[PDB]
Paper text:
The response regulator VbrR from Vibrio parahaemolyticus, a member of the OmpR/PhoB family, regulates virulence and antibiotic resistance genes. VbrR is a member of the OmpR/PhoB family and contains an N-terminal receiver domain (RD) and a C-terminal DNA-binding domain (DBD), connected by a flexible linker, and can directly bind with the promoter region of exsC to mediate its downregulation. The VbrK/VbrR TCS is activated by host-derived nitrite during infection, which leads to the downregulation of Type-3 secretion system-1 (T3SS1) via repression of its positive regulator exsC for maximal virulence. In the cell or solution, VbrR proteins exist mainly as inhibitory dimers formed through the DBD, and phosphorylation of RDs allows the formation of RD dimers, which in turn changes the conformation of the DBD from an inhibitory state to an active state.
To gain insights into the DNA-binding-induced conformational changes of the DBD, we purified the full-length VbrR protein and used it for crystallization, but the crystals obtained only contained the DBD. Finally, the DBD structure was determined to 1.45 Å resolution using the SAD method. The structure of DBD forms a centrosymmetrical homodimer. The DBD homodimer interface involves α6-α8 from each protomer, and extensive hydrophilic and hydrophobic interactions are identified. In contrast to the DBD in the VbrR-DNA complex structure, which forms a compact and globular conformation, the separated DBD structure adopts an extended conformation with dimensions of 31.8 Å ×36.6 Å×72.2 Å. The key residue Arg190 from recognition helix α8 forms two hydrogen bonds with residue Asn184. Therefore, it is conceivable that the DBD in solution intends to form an autoinhibitory dimer conformation that precludes DNA binding.
Numbering used by the authors:
A (entry chain B): 127 to 220
B (entry chain A): 126 to 220
The structure:
């Protein structure tokens, strides 16, 4: 099946892309990103989400890996004074 | 000089041993690397992206910057492609 947008005609089966009438050569990764955005018009994705959805889950460390490792440190070192700064990151107090 | 010591915590960099409140603590390699980094930088706030680079290694695998440069590549190869940059959050294709 094909996916159409204003400018794009994308073939999911063959990885072929037509842009305003012209056939476009994309890398595999470029293609997956283009197709992901083109299949989800009007929706904002964070860079973290796009990394996950396009490059795949669990192939290399991400910002989630960082959060998971902090939680694991907290369990193995009870009372470890790592402060969470909601929506930024972490700080060790003492 | 092999050791970093903070409250209740003793970390030996050479032998990679962690003593917390008098107990030897078993950590994976990256748990250790993360702990030692934070203990060596008390009072300092790091973003998750910074911790990734400092602890897991800078420029070793795809990151959020790889997403940014791939959007630039798409915009170059498809001149006029309507990807919107929502600065400091991410990306949206309008239509």
């Amino acid at each position: 099946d094909k996916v159409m947008t204003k400018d794009l005609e994308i073939d999911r089966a063959t990885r072929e892309v037509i842009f305003k009438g012209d056939l476009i050569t994309l890398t595999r990764t470029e293609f997956d990103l283009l197709l992901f955005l083109a299949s989800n018009l009007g929706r904002v994705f964070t860079r973290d989400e796009l990394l996950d959805h396009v490059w795949g889950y669990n192939h290399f460390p991400t910002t989630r890996t960082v959060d998971t490792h902090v939680l694991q440190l907290r369990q193995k070192l009870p009372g470890l004074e790592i402060e969470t700064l909601r929506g930024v990151g972490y700080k060790m107090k003492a």
